[PDB]
A paper describes a structure:
NBDs inhibit gp120 binding to the cellular receptor CD4 by direct binding to the Phe43 cavity of HIV-1 envelope glycoprotein gp120. The structures revealed that the compounds mimicked the binding of Phe43 of CD4 to gp120 and occupied the cavity in the CD4 binding site of gp120, as shown in previously reported structures of NBD compounds.
The trifluoro-methane group of NBD-14204 in region I contacted Thr257, Glu370, Ile371, and Trp427 with hydrophobic interaction. The nitrogen atom in the pyridine ring made a hydrogen bond to the carbonyl oxygen of Asn425. In addition, the pyrrole ring showed hydrophobic contact in region II with Trp427. Unlike NBD-14204, the nitrogen atom in the pyrrole ring of NBD-14208 made a hydrogen bond to the carbonyl oxygen of Asn425. However, the electron density of region III, particularly their thiazole groups, was poorly defined, even though the two structures were determined with relatively high resolutions of 1.9 Å and 2.1 Å for NBD-14204 and NBD-14208, respectively, indicating that the thiazole rings in the region III are flexible and need to be further optimized to enable the region to make favorable interactions with neighboring residues. NBD-14204 showed equal antiviral activity against all the clinical isolates tested, including the Rec clones. The IC50 values were in the range of 0.24–0.9 µM with an overall mean of 0.47 ± 0.03 µM, showing slightly better activity against the clinical isolates than against the lab-adapted HIV-1HXB2 (IC50 = 0.96 ± 0.1 µM). The antiviral data indicated that the pyridine-containing compound, NBD-14204, showed about five-fold better antiviral activity than the phenyl-containing compound, NBD-14208. Comparing those values with those obtained with the HIV-1 neutralization assays and calculating the ratios, we can hypothesize that the antiviral activity of NBD-14208 is primarily due to its activity against both gp120 and RT, while the primary activity of NBD-14204 is mostly against gp120 and its activity against RT may just play a secondary role.
Numbering used by the authors: 44 to 124, 198 to 301, 324 to 355, 357 to 396, 411 to 492
Amino acid sequence: VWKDADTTLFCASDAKAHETEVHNVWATHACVPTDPNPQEIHLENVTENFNMWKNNMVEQMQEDVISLWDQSLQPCVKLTGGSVIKQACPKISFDPIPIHYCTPAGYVILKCNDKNFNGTGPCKNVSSVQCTHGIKPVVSTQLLLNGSLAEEEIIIRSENLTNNAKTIIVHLNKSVEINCTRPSNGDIRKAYCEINGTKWNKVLKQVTEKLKEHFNNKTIIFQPPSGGDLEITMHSFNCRGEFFYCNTTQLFNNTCINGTITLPCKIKQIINMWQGTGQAMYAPPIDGKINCVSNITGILLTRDGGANNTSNETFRPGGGNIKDNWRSELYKYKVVQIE
Ligand SMILES: NC[C@H](NC(=O)c1ccc(-c2ccc(C(F)(F)F)cn2)[nH]1)c1ncc(CO)s1
Ligand SMILES: *[C@@H]1O[C@H](CO)[C@@H](O)[C@H](O)[C@H]1NC(C)=O
Ligand SMILES: *[C@@H]1O[C@H](CO)[C@@H](O)[C@H](O)[C@H]1NC(C)=O
Ligand SMILES: *[C@@H]1O[C@H](CO)[C@@H](O)[C@H](O)[C@H]1NC(C)=O
Ligand SMILES: *[C@@H]1O[C@H](CO)[C@@H](O)[C@H](O)[C@H]1NC(C)=O
Ligand SMILES: *[C@@H]1O[C@H](CO)[C@@H](O)[C@H](O)[C@H]1NC(C)=O
Ligand SMILES: *[C@@H]1O[C@H](CO)[C@@H](O)[C@H](O)[C@H]1NC(C)=O
């Protein structure tokens, strides 16, 4: 017997105390070690309602990631609120590790185990856990990287599909690798990401098939982002401490709905901070081969409005509200207070 409630969670992880990597350093002083013997209990004859779009755990993870980045990254110049802060900017070691979110005494986490659960409504296979699974705090736009996969079918998630201003999270059931590289040998900020077009276009085709099921079999068209800042019009992520911006036009090629797809990328030293606080400048990139191989596990999409009059629906790669990144992993959990 319990009741939905919000409370302050703590974090746990397997951070190494001897590592200089900044996530390990943060988690070493802001998280406790993981519990060696996890205690998950299936709750029999128990149905429970979930709502991933009103889940205070999302707000709490966002606060953690903001804190982590604020004490880890070291721009040479920070421009925020009309002021300018200049400081030392050594190169850092950067590579996310899994963070587990845990309830204090008197509370527990309920976990939805229905494999086609869309994030809202009743769940018939519910268990209780003390902590979530390990979630990597990967900050990206357009593509969700290094996350968990849907266990059966591709899942379309939205707080309201009819409202085109609401972001769509596409949860994939097969990961697709994206392999990004700034080579050793020219223009030191020039990079590229390689994706196996065979695997990708197959998944994309399956994604379009799912979208048809929710939009009454209209024609599904992909278009590049309309406009905005580069962090939004590009797939932006952080690889080894460097800020990558990749052009995803060839990833959403309507015609292919087989060879290697090569996306042009650039590392940028001057960025708009995803925390919303302003602009920051970092030092030039490190020497040598900079390489990140990530698994694409989801896609953020925004649907064009005003198209009811037509027979097609147009989708543009989306993102920017990084909270949706955490929502994509926390959708199956909720906190309750034991009574
Ligand atoms: N120029 C406009 C500005 N947009 C941003 O700040 C913004 C959005 C997303 C990112 C971002 C994403 C990913 C990465 C990384 F590389 F790490 F993956 C870096 N940045 N930045 C604002 N308009 C209004 C606002 C409210 O006050 S904020
Ligand atoms: C999710 O499931 C609920 C309950 O079955 C339904 O009301 C809602 O429309 C669904 N959302 C999507 C995006 O399928
Ligand atoms: C992923 O889901 C699609 C339908 O959404 C299904 O046809 C496909 O077989 C699934 N793939 C895997 C590997 O389960
Ligand atoms: C969903 O969005 C449509 C279009 O904006 C709106 O008319 C409707 O009221 C929304 N539904 C809910 C439950 O907010
Ligand atoms: C990633 O791409 C580079 C080429 O830049 C290649 O050397 C490397 O083997 C690739 N890695 C994987 C896992 O495909
Ligand atoms: C992406 O590439 C296409 C074609 O190369 C180009 O027309 C478009 O402007 C690029 N997008 C951005 C945001 O630079
Ligand atoms: C994704 O995970 C791999 C393996 O740990 C890592 O090398 C890569 O840097 C990660 N990608 C991002 C964007 O953090």
